Write a protein that binds this ligand. Structure first.
Ligand SMILES: *[C@@H]1O[C@H](CO)[C@@H](O[C@@H]2O[C@H](CO)[C@@H](O)[C@H](O)[C@H]2NC(C)=O)[C@H](O)[C@H]1NC(C)=O
Ligand SMILES: O=c1ccn([C@@H]2O[C@H](COP(=O)(O)OP(=O)(O)O)[C@@H](O)[C@H]2O)c(=O)[nH]1
Ligand SMILES: *[C@@H]1O[C@H](CO[C@@H]2O[C@@H](C)[C@@H](O)[C@@H](O)[C@@H]2O)[C@@H](O)[C@H](O)[C@H]1NC(C)=O
Ligand SMILES: OC[C@H]1O[C@@H](O)[C@H](O)[C@@H](O)[C@H]1O
Ligand SMILES: [Mn+2]
Length: 267
């Protein structure tokens, strides 16, 4: 599928239970390292394999290119295709990850597309997935069901009426972090080229899901995805899946906190 970089993995020999696909720009090496030492550390969670890969495009900068090439050689966890890695190309990045799942890891039980400014509790997510008994046509996260396109011309998320001509967006989940059974990736890739393009990646996935008649489901009876951020407590982060607004230094302090407090019980 025209991939410049592929992770050294074989999902047929060892079918992963959860695959994390993380978006980060080239210069965000600090974010990728913090994730690699924290929630992205590959391991067995309740006997289920967790794999973590980073989605990258390409950049004009030769320096950055070299750096990333070196990182791929040292880590072997980068998925890359030739597309200008900018905020308005995140739909290409997301479709790149979905294509990678479809071509090289269709065996994954579940896939999580996440951003790099985030805390992910994989242990609580794995537990909640094994309790849902939903292994096909499954898609969850922070559900956004009546969103209106931003028409403020200078907003980061402005879309003109030519880019998106309708009053409302389809049902979708925040791109901060969404999870789907591995089969959905193949369906989204197959229908992607026939769905009207939009530069907001989570909206675009929503348009595809709408085309495929796959409905959005809440993961749990309590909220577990927090795109707005949360006040930190070891007890709260033990009972959530994802939290946004987390810079790298903060991610390491939180992981040290949960590591320092393992063994303590919580109200
Ligand atoms: C997203 O990435 C694509 C692919 O790199 C960009 O399209 C190319 O843009 C470069 C310069 O930006 C041109 O030299 C090429 O002719 C374009 N090729 C293709 C395949 O279209 C595109 O511009 C990027 N989008 C944004 C918003 O920057
Ligand atoms: O050129 C870019 C810019 C951003 N991102 C990633 O896209 C996500 C969204 O960017 P940001 O967090 O700045 O936006 P917001 O949270 O405001 O939507 C983050 O994981 C970034 O690392 C990326 O992969 N390439
Ligand atoms: C998932 O399934 C768990 C156990 O399996 C169930 O046991 C049999 C006897 C039937 O009750 C059948 O529904 C299941 O296969 C349940 O404990 C659990 O509640 C289920 N999850 C949900 C949210 O329904
Ligand atoms: O391109 C749309 C973007 O808007 C928001 C989200 O946090 C990003 O990950 C992405 O979905
Ligand atoms: Mn963000």
């Amino acid at each position: 599928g025209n991939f410049l970089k592929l992770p050294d993995t074989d999902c047929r020999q060892t079918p992963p239970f959860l695959v994390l696909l993380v978006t980060s720009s080239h210069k965000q090496l600090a974010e990728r390292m913090a994730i690699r030492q924290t929630w992205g550390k590959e391991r067995m969670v309740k006997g289920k394999q967790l794999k973590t890969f980073f989605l990258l495009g390409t950049t004009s900068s030769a320096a950055e290119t070299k750096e990333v090439d070196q990182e791929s050689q040292r880590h072997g966890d980068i998925i890359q295709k030739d597309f200008l890695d900018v905020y308005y190309n995140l739909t290409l990045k997301t479709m790149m990850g979905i294509e990678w799942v479809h071509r090289f890891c269709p065996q994954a039980a579940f896939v999580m597309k996440t951003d790099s400014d985030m805390f992910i509790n994989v242990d609580y997510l794995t537990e909640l997935l094994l309790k849902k008994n939903r292994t096909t046509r499954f898609f969850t996260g922070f559900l956004k069901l009546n969103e209106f396109p931003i028409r403020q011309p200078f907003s980061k998320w402005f879309v003109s009426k030519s880019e998106y001509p309708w009053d409302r967006y389809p049902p979708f989940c925040s791109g901060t972090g969404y999870v789907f059974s591995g089969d959905v990736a193949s369906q989204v890739y197959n229908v992607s080229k026939s769905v009207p393009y939009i530069k907001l990646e989570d909206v675009f996935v929503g348009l595809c899901l709408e085309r495929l008649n796959i409905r959005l489901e809440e993961l749990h009876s309590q909220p577990t995805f927090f795109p707005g951020g949360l006040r930190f407590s070891v007890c709260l982060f033990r009972r959530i899946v994802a939290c946004h607004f987390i810079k790298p230094r903060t991610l390491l302090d939180y992981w040290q906190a949960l590591e320092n407090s393992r063994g303590e019980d919580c109200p």
